[PDB]
Each structure stands twice: as C-alpha cells, then as structure tokens.
UniProtKB/Swiss-Prot annotation:
Gene that specifies this protein: GLR3.2
Protein's name in the database: Glutamate receptor 3.2
Binding of L-methionine, residues: 80-82, 87, 132, 172-175
Glycan-carrying positions: 68, 163, 237
Organism of origin: Arabidopsis thaliana (Mouse-ear cress)
Binding residue positions for glycine: 80-82, 87, 132, 172-175
Covered residues, full protein: 465 to 811 of 912
Length: 240
C-alpha cells in the first residue's frame, strides 16, 4: 500500500510528451495523461508519486532512466519510453500505448532516400540526445560514431539541417512529427526502420505491467487514448 516512486523524464524539449509543469515538482503531458487515465481502470489502488529524472539541461538518457527501475531507485517509469529489446531484458513494459519507430528526416529535395542512403554515405547524422537511436546506429547499423551529432530540440534540428552541419537526422516518428509541425522545409525519407512503440516500465515479473496493458487497451477501445493524443499532439503549421 506504499506510494510507488514513478520516474518521469525531465524533458528539455518536445515537452508535449511529458515535462515538469512551470518549473514546479509537478508534471504534465501526453504520457502523464495516458498513465493517469489507465490507473483509473486498474481494479486496485496504485498510490504513486512522480520523481523527475534528468539534469534539467538536456533530455535524459532513456537507457539510464529505465535502469533506475532495475536498481530500485524507481518502482516504475512513465514517459515516452521506447520498448527496445535490450530494455525488455531488465524491466517489464506494458503493451505500447503509441506506435513509434526510427525514421530519417532531411531537407526537402535531399537525395537521401532512407537509412540505407545514410549507411552507404559519409555525411554527418543528427540524433536526439539520450535516444536509443544513438546506440542503434552505432551497434546495429555500424554507422561510424564520428558521424553522429547530438541535438537537443526541434529548433536545433532545423538549424543543423539548414546549415549542413548534418545531412539528416534519425529519430523516432513522434518527435519528427512534432518537428515537421513546427519547422517547414523538411521531410521524412523512407519508412520506419524500427517498430518499438512507447510503454511504461515496471520491474521484471511485475503484475502491474500486465494489468496496465489491459487498462491501456481499455483506453484504446473507448477512444480515450486517441482523445489524449488529440489534446497534446495535433497542432501543425505545415502542409507539404
Ligand atoms: Na526547439
């Protein structure tokens, strides 16, 4: 019956997903709304307190964040957390509450067609600081570490692409959709080349990971999950 210590990423950018409210110790955003809606559908109480994770200067390392459940600093983590295979070895995720996977974004009229263009070329590649994309590109795709440039925010994405400091950026589709809604002149090249959605994570063998999956499914089936997306993530200033 004790309050679960739930870690939440202290996002410096793309704060619509989850962030600190107005520099308080309170939190808000898309993932928080999904979690609180889901908890209402759980058949037993889930007392909890949210605990911000990160330096407040840059988006946190999501691998390190999830590891804080494994080592017991957090009882759970709630946020925009990609369900990637290495993390599933050390926590139990819910079923995903939103689709996500890595895509390539570049200037309109780029010759880049997708991640296979990057693998066979020399240009620098941007990624979001703290994203699994960094490890994915180095490890799975064997892209030279020297080519990778960490970027902090959608303004930095537009600047790096415009000034040619990177040829393209690799990041998960939800961040790229928010970027393309704010900054005109860029486009996704190719399909997703990973398919890990976002989920909440609990300790290995936690019953709450399974109970929360049924609750998330309930939200999907009633249309509440779509309405929460609409609340946080539907604004766009871009056609093309
Ligand atoms: Na920005």
């Amino acid at each position: 019956g004790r309050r679960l210590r739930i870690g939440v990423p202290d996002r410096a950018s793309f704060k619509e997903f989850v962030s600190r409210l107005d520099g308080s110790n309170k939190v808000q955003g898309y993932a928080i709304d999904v979690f609180e809606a889901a908890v209402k559908l759980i058949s037993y109480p889930v007392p909890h307190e949210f605990v911000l994770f990160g330096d407040g200067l840059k988006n946190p390392n999501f691998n390190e964040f999830v590891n804080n459940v494994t080592i017991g600093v957090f009882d759970a983590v709630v946020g925009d957390i990609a369900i990637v295979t290495k993390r599933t070895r050390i926590v139990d995720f819910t079923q995903p509450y939103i689709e996500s996977g890595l895509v390539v974004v570049a200037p309109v009229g780029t010759p880049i067609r997708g991640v296979d263009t990057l693998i066979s070329s020399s240009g620098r590649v941007g990624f979001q600081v703290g994203s699994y994309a960094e490890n994915y590109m180095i490890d799975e795709l064997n892209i030279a570490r020297s080519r990778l440039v960490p970027l902090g925010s959608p303004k930095e994405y537009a600047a790096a692409l415009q000034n040619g400091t990177v040829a393209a950026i690799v990041d998960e589709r939800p961040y790229v959709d928010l970027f393309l809604s704010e900054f005109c002149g860029f486009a996704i090249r190719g399909q997703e080349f990973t398919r890990s959605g976002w989920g909440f994570a609990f300790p290995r063998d936690s019953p709450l990971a399974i109970d929360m999956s049924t609750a998330i499914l309930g939200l999907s089936e009633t249309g509440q999950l779509q309405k929460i997306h609409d609340k946080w993530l539907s604004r766009s200033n871009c056609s093309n």
